[PDB]
RNA sequence: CCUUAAAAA
RNA sequence: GGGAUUAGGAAUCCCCCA
RNA sequence: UGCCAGCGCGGUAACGGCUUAAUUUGACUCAACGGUGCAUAUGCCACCGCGUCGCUACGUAAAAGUC
RNA sequence: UGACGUGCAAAUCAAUCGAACCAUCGCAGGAAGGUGGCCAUGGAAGUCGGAAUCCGCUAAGGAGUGUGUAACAACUCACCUGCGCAAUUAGUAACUAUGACUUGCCUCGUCCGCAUAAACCAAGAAGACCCUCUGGGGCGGACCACAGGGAUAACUGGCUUGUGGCCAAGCGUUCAUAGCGACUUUUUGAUCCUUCGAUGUCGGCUUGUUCAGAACGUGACUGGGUUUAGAACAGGUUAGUUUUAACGAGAGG
């Protein structure tokens, strides 16, 4: 029934939404818990880290966790080993090129939103956000 | 200056 | 041609009387 | 040289371990050797200790004293000279696993200096004289003043240090003098006034460094009147000159005016930290008496104020019953974490959810003061300890449960799970 | 008539004064 | 030249 | 500092005029 | 409960040694070189003798102090 | 420390002695998308810090110049479009400190003793002080007498201002300049120019004190500190002639 406009608060690499979100989010009207549960071991287990956005629509007067990725972190997303770093190990420059599939293959879910030429514009876009590789695709 | 005494002439 | 006169004074000390005629 | 603070919290970890270790009998044998003190005269008074163990109405006990003595003894002589901030021996053979027993020596050399000799060879490591060091103690630069020169001194809880000292010539008295004596005078107070430039700062030089302060001292301390003048002079100190105690007399003056003034130092001090109580508290009521409610107090609001942004000014009693214990299931079904209040510690109903009835096991004890230790940095703004000494202080407790702070803004009362989330996702952006 | 002076006086005082505190 | 505070009528 | 004597330590014995 | 809390009692029946994951352990003049010989096949778990100065308390008491 | 003080008086109410006397030698409109960039940070998403500073659209827009917010939000600027002639009196006790033991410099000490008619034409006065290779002398390298010197100090004043006094890293929760801020002679030194046949030197009108501008205001007032002889000293203590013509939550107000 309630709905209302999403916040998009996460910023965090962390499962489980919080260190322990299950029970502080409760009110006294009360909630049916959903995508706070399992769910965020589909996104853990799979999109895990990179800070990924979450949408708050609330359909039925209860947490709804989206799991899709905006941007700009999207591009880190390219590697096969990412065991954690603990903390203060030198800012850890993880980083080793790129797949030469970047172009549409990966950037077909960045297609909502971004507007102008597509070929001359969107696939072009995505190349700047590769500051982080240092190497390019070369 | 000649010393004495009564006559006018000392301190002369 | 006025007359002369003495008179004492401090320590010991003459001092000129002389009338003024 | 944040790795030097690392090895502080290993003397931490140390000295919990070692408080915690204790052993059957008098075998037990704490140490501490004082620094600029020879080792070998404490050798000496250890082999008369030896002497007293010669004779004992017991077997086992006289064994292991004399097996702790040996062990003392053999570990001493590794060292050759006196180490730096004293030395701190510990010896024994402490019981652990189920009763197991072992012989354990425990050696360090602290990151923090004191000046005390303490043996006592009974049951229990008596680590307490050591807690003082536990402590970030500011350091207590005293200048003492005198007619011939000045001692730069210091103190630091236990630890007195002469940092300098000099000597000059005085001007004093005109005496006879002449018709003019009065431009002796002015040479007078010319020396005087040279006295006050270069010798303050050269304490420039030797205490404030670099912008920051090195001291919360700067005690005057002197016979004569130059520190009447000291104070009272705009060649003193910029900022500094708030952070004077009290005068302090000395009637015999020199070292021994330095030493009377170590004590007088100690209970000005207790009153400058009766100052620090009641300011420190005394914000805090400052906070209360806006309607803005950028305050907060009690176990309720004041964790998930800490799990938001740091609170501007933390506030917590020393001794606090409520302990953080872990609620965590054996199979972790459920993590779970909550503050203990004595009601709540009486009842125990929260160990048993009524989702499954499974009590939640104990894993190790993490005690809400030391939870506070472990990371406040890393929670950001700065720990702070208050004592119930003050008169404002037994109001902070019984009026406030004894904890809270000053918030750097207001904060709403959590509603629905919007306003919920608004205010959780961002404890989480601020985590 | 005549003798003159010589003495310590009133006006030698000062003189005494002025010798008294160089 | 002296002798445990580290434990019995 | 290490031995020896003593039940064990000291000790002794082995290395400017205003 | 185990000189702690309490009422004369209460102190678990009121080769040496560093090192080492271990260097098993007992044994200190002659009379050393699983826990408890200070409960006794077994229970319980007496010469090695007897004022000054510095701390604390009201000359004395209270300490293991230094001569 | 009275009166007098060129007086009644060379001391009042052999006149000379630390070697006598005599003689001789602008306004309006656009200021935005990928993207709240990366990283650090409790948080800082133009505007805390570090590095980087690339481009789609387009008549404009920076990985943002200056305000603001905890941070966003918000308001603007770079750019863009339109309009009678005496006489001054080494090492150490089991908390620490300490240490058995092995007339006072500092000094205004606090509640193991540095060192028990006339004068005169400012006056009377050839300074009883200072001084007779040396930026005065001494050092380093005062019971006193006389002849002279500002050629050579101490009082003041003059010259000098070394001394003293009166751009903006940062502080100020945030923010450089609300308020602070690192890198003139009222002080003194120095000079000897003026004054040695003389310019009466201090303070005042609990310590004598200054302290806590006007010859270092004012002696043709005080003698307290200095202070010649009594008991060599910027070592102390004592007694010693001073001359003449509404707002704010409240508390507060």
Known sequence: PNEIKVVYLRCTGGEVGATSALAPKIGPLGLSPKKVGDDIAKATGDWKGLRITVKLTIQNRQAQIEVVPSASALIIKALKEPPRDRKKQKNIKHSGNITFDEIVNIARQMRHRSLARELSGTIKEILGTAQSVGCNVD | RVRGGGTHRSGQ | ?21 | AADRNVEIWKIKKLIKSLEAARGNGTSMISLIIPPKDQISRVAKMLADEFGTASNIKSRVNRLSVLGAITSVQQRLKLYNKVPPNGLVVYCGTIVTEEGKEKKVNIDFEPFKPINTSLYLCDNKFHTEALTALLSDDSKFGFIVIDGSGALFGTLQGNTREVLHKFTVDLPKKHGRGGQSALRFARLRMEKRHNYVRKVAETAVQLFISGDKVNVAGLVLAGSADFKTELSQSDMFDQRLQSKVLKLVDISYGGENGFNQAIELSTEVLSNVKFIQEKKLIGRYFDEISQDTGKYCFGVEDTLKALEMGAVEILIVYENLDIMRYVLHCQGTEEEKILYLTPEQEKDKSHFTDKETGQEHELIESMPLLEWFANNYKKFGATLEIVTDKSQEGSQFVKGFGGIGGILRYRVDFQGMEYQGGDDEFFDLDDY | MEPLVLSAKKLSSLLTCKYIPP
């Open chain 3, 1 to 21: 041609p006025k007359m002369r006169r003495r008179t004492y004074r401090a320590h010991g000390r003459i001092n000129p009387y002389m009338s003024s005629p």
